[PDB]
């Protein structure tokens, strides 16, 4: 199947790697029982103005995000750096819930990289924002027949806000070059303006309640987690593991790495997590990949035999996988270490060939001086390759050998001179017609 052919010539072929498979799955989340207070965020009698937007900290609780659909009749989340359906599988150091009221045509401004009056003077999201924006129409609560003027936004400001910066100042704004002296004049405006939310307004002019959930998915200790039961901690076995949402497969062993208290994960050169602090016991654990290695198949031609020998490359014969059952080791075929002869080479463990003390010319190279051949009952044998026969030269101070005859030899040397000249119609190959 690797060669995509039904016939194989004599040789050695690199097939897929073997891999020890995880025996179980481990989940390790912090011991937290309190439920996060999302009810009082989405069920407030009145929301703040966007210029004076409220920020609430969520910590040390269990966050089930599927209950947010019950507190408010919004149609969907709008999340960044995360999907709404994966929130329950994750852990965060903190959560912040920002809540305010804007009008419908400004909701597009609650997003990273936006400009406009709201995004520049009232509420600004960072370009690297990770979190979710939940907005829903609130015409039935924030509108009045005479108009609702309790909700305000900043219209004038000397400079744009930084991300997550709040400005509740009410100093008179100077649009011209004359001083204002704390008085609204001609180019001196009061910086705040009120929405006039009326029930008769069109959709884009209607009030919308917005909740912004911001969190951190970077490696750090976590106190907000989704609904997820923890299993026990299994060491010295190949397992699937989940530490605070960080998933992977490998063997967990006790670590002597000295994490600082703010460190939950350790990363290697390839930015892969190779160390983790257990969220419950607070112990440091090393992560190592389970077990793997290259497999080569040594065959004479299928015209000769269907017998093969297998080389486990760069591997102790004792670490050759012996995992029982087909779900603990890929590939699922098995070659018995006792059934077929086992030989240790510096290139790895060779199974299926008998090593012999004779030395022959190399037929199928295995590596590190070992070659294999199909010889006599015919079977695959392994041997140390022969460099040739020894010849002691009868040298002395006064001895010479002089030929008395000669042989006229005619030998052949083959040299490539040219290769096939090819032409490609780029458009035909790529685009057809």
């Amino acid at each position: 199947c690797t060669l995509k052919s039904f016939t194989v010539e004599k040789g050695i072929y690199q097939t897929s790697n073997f891999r020890v498979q995880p025996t179980e799955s481990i989940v390790r989340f912090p011991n937290i029982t309190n439920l996060c207070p999302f009810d009082e965020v989405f069920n407030a009698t009145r929301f703040a103005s966007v210029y004076a937007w409220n920020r609430k900290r969520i910590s040390n609780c269990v966050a089930d995000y599927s209950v947010l659909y019950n507190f408010a009749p919004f149609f969907a989340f709008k999340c960044y750096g995360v999907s709404p359906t994966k929130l329950n599988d994750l852990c965060f150091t903190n959560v912040y819930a920002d809540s305010f009221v804007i009008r419908g045509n400004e909701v597009s401004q609650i997003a990273p990289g936006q400009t406009g009056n709201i995004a520049d003077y009232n509420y600004k999201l960072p370009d690297d924002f990770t979190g979710c924006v939940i907005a829903w129409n609130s015409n039935k609560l924030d509108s009045k027949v005479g108009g609702n003027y309790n909700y305000q936004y900043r219209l004038f400001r000397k400079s744009n806000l930084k991300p997550f910066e709040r400005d509740i100042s009410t100093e008179i704004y100077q649009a011209g070059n004359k001083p204002c002296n704390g008085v609204a004049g001609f180019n001196c405006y009061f910086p705040l303006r009120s929405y006039g939310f009326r029930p008769t307004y069109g959709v884009g002019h209607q009030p919308y309640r917005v909740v912004v959930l911001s969190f951190e998915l970077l490696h750090a200790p976590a106190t907000v987690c989704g609904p997820k039961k923890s299993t026990n901690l299994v060491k010295n076995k190949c397992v699937n593991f989940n530490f605070n949402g960080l998933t992977g497969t490998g063997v967990l062993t006790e670590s002597n790495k000295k994490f600082l208290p703010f460190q939950q994960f350790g990363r290697d050169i390839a930015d892969t997590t190779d160390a983790v602090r257990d969220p419950q016991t607070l112990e440091i654990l090393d992560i190592t990949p389970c077990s793997f290695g290259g497999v080569s198949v040594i065959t004479p031609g299928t015209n000769t035999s269907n017998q093969v020998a297998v080389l486990y490359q760069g591997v102790n014969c004792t670490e050759v996988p012996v995992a029982i059952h087909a779900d603990q080791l890929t590939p699922t075929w098995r070659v018995y270490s006792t059934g077929s002869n086992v030989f240790q080479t510096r290139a790895g463990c060779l199974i299926g060939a008998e090593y012999v003390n004779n030395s022959y010319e190399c037929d199928i190279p295995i590596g590190a001086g070992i070659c294999a051949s199909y010889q006599t009952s015919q079977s695959i044998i392994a041997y140390t390759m022969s460099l040739g026969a020894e010849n002691l030269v009868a040298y002395s101070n006064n001895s010479i050998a002089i030929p008395t005859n000669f042989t006229i030899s005619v030998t052949t040397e083959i040299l490539p001179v040219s290769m096939t000249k090819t032409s490609v119609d780029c458009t035909m190959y790529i685009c057809g017609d």
């Epitope: 026990n232 901690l233 060491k235 062993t253 006790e254 670590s255 002597n256 000295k258 208290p261 257990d278 016991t281 607070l282 112990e283 440091i284």
Partner: antibody, heavy 121, light 106 residues
Framework: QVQLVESGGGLVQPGGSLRLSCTAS????????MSWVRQAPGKGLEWVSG????????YYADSVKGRFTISRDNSKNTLYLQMNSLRVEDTAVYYC??????????????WGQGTLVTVSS | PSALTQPPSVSVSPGQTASITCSGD??????AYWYQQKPGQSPVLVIF???MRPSGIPERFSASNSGNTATLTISGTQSIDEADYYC?????????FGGGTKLTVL
């Protein structure tokens, strides 16, 4: 409420033998590594031996090596310290302490009351 | 490491600051653990992993481990804090303790 109760301590003649037993309650016994630590009257604390969570790996101090043997029964939630060839220096109050690991990142979070092994003639 | 050197005794008046030290070869490269043992009582852990305290240990307790020494500082030493404090570390799956220090409260 985690509770470690010790038993099996008494007077022995030198060269005799004992078996200490430590029983844990109100805790997952298999999830903890266990250890024996002794304190002679007036002297300091000395780690005697410790056993892994499953009991597959065992560790002993040099002054106690070969002589003592530590085992555990996860079904009974009990830790055993088989004591033999007890020399005079072995007189101390013996504690059993639970810890999650022995790689360096875990403390002895729970200690027992302590059992006395006095050896003399 | 292998020998955690510790002063015999530290004498402190109520409300003063006690500073019990633990010395060992490059002790700053390992985690440090402090236990408080009272007369006729079992040991009680008060510091784990250098500077962390178990739940229920009074906030007055503090510790550090830099260089080749680890120190335990009970600020505002009260009469209750009179006890025998110990210092512990791990080495090759073996626990190593310090000699011990009695905090004599005046």
């Amino acid at each position: 409420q985690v509770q470690l109760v010790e038993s099996g301590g008494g007077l022995v003649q030198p060269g005799g033998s004992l078996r200490l037993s430590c029983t844990a309650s109100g805790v997952t016994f298999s999830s903890y590594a266990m250890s024996w630590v002794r304190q002679a009257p007036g002297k300091g604390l000395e780690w005697v031996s410790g056993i892994s969570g499953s009991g597959d790996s065992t560790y002993y101090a040099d002054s106690v090596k070969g002589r003592f043997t530590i085992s555990r029964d996860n079904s009974k939630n009990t830790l055993y310290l088989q004591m033999n060839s007890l020399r005079v220096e072995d007189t101390a109050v013996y504690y059993c302490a639970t810890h999650y690991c022995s790689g360096g990142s875990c403390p002895f979070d729970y200690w027992g009351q302590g059992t006395l092994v006095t050896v003399s003639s | 490491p292998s020998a955690l050197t510790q002063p015999p005794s530290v004498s402190v008046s109520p409300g003063q600051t006690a500073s019990i030290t633990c010395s060992g070869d490059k002790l700053g490269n390992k985690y440090a653990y402090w236990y408080q043992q009272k007369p006729g009582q079992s040991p009680v852990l008060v510091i784990f992993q250098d500077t962390m305290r178990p739940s229920g240990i009074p906030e007055r307790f503090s510790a550090s481990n830099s260089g080749n020494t680890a120190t335990l500082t009970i600020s505002g030493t009260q009469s209750i804090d009179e006890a025998d404090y110990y210092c512990q570390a791990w080495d090759s799956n073996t626990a190593v303790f310090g000699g011990g220090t009695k905090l004599t409260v005046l």
